[PDB]
């Protein structure tokens, strides 16, 4: 079919994943021997077609990650689907680029911590021990407008 040939060629181009001659593209899967696939490559982004030499590519750094993280300011939250495909082992970069240099959203330790769009000043700030964090939880923020007097009682 017209769509089946395009789907198979796109997967085959994805399976090949390398820029090679368009002539070899047809013989790799023995299906894209008609002009329909070549026109589909120029018309669809699944197969990259350009006037240059035979080459099909995908249609990469923590610096780009930070800019991409900054690219989602006051917007929806993105996933690392493009980040890891556009930069393999992008989860490691999050661990390496700590101190907010690469923020993430670790869903759990059973799904490779699927991250989300996040930017921060400190990010981790691990040096504050949980004892300070526990006493932060142990101290409960008090009730209503008596509190402005309460901090006045403490001298504020």
């Amino acid at each position: 079919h017209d769509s089946s040939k395009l789907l198979w060629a796109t997967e085959y181009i994805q399976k090949k994943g390398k820029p090679v001659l368009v002539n070899e593209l047809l013989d790799y899967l023995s299906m894209k021997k008609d002009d329909k696939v070549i026109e589909l490559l120029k018309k669809l982004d699944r197969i990259e077609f350009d006037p240059k030499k035979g080459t099909f590519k995908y249609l990469h750094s923590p610096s780009e990650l930070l800019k991409l993280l900054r690219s989602q300011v006051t917007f929806k939250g993105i996933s690392c689907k493009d980040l890891k495909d556009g930069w393999p082992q992008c989860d490691e970069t999050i661990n390496q680029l700590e101190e907010d240099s690469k923020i993430l959203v670790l869903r759990t330790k059973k799904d490779k911590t699927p991250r989300y769009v996040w930017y921060n000043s400190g990010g981790n700030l691990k040096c504050i021990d949980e004892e300070f964090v526990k006493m932060w939880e142990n101290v409960q923020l008090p009730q209503f407008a008596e509190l402005p007097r309460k901090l006045q009682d403490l001298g504020l």
């Binding site: 006051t74 929806k76 939250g77 907010d100 923020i103 993430l104 959203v105 869903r107 989300y116 996040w118 921060n120 000043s121 400190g122 990010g123 700030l125 040096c127 504050i128 300070f132 964090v133 006493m135 932060w136 101290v139 409960q140 923020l141 008090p142 209503f144 407008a145 509190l147 402005p148 309460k150 901090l151 403490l154 001298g155 504020l156």
Partner: protein
């Protein structure tokens, strides 16, 4: 606008003394003044177990309070929309109160370990003090006994721990400095 600095400050503390997930909901609430409940829900694309306490923490933090933004349902019903009223005046009330609370607490820790005065019997595992020591001190016993176990006493709160509390204070002063400086910048107008 100074109110943005208040919200910008809210990110700092909610990312300094809280986790990263504590700011995305903080972002979402402050993204829109009157935001529908489901709109925030679709943003995170996760369950309510990872969202509920975050807003409850913020409402307990008094920075933002979920307001009764009443909406009339189109099905001959009355179902309101959960839009949070960001309670900026109460934010400085709650957040600064803890800072004043912790700094005096760490001040208390400083003088507790400042000089070893109280004593202790390791055999009995009970602390003592100088006033107990003198009434327990004897001419023959140049040390302090422990009449409970009939054992000599040892000092407590050595000089090392005073440095630790001070180093806690120095970290406390440094790590809360961005929080307070962004907090005291709001003190000019109290908005």
């Amino acid at each position: 606008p100074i109110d943005d600095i208040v919200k910008n400050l809210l990110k700092f503390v909610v990312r300094g003394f809280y986790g990263g997930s504590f700011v995305l909901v903080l972002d979402a609430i402050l993204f829109h003044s009157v935001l529908a409940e489901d709109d925030l829900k679709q943003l995170l694309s996760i369950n309510k177990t990872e969202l509920g306490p975050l807003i409850a923490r913020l409402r307990s933090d008094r920075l933002i309070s979920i307001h009764k933004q009443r909406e009339y349902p189109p099905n001959s019903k009355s179902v309101e929309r959960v839009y949070y009223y960001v309670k900026y005046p109460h934010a400085i009330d709650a957040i600064k109160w803890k800072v004043h609370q912790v700094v005096q607490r760490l001040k208390d820790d400083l003088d507790k370990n400042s000089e070893p005065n109280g004593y202790m019997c390791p055999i009995c595992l009970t602390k003592y003090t100088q006033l107990e020591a003198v009434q327990l001190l004897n001419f023959d016993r140049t040390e302090f006994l422990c009449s409970l176990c009939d054992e000599p006493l040892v000092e407590d709160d050595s000089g090392k721990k005073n440095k630790e509390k001070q180093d806690k204070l120095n970290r406390l002063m440094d790590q809360i400095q961005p929080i307070i400086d962004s907090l005291k910048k709001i003190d000019d107008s109290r908005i």
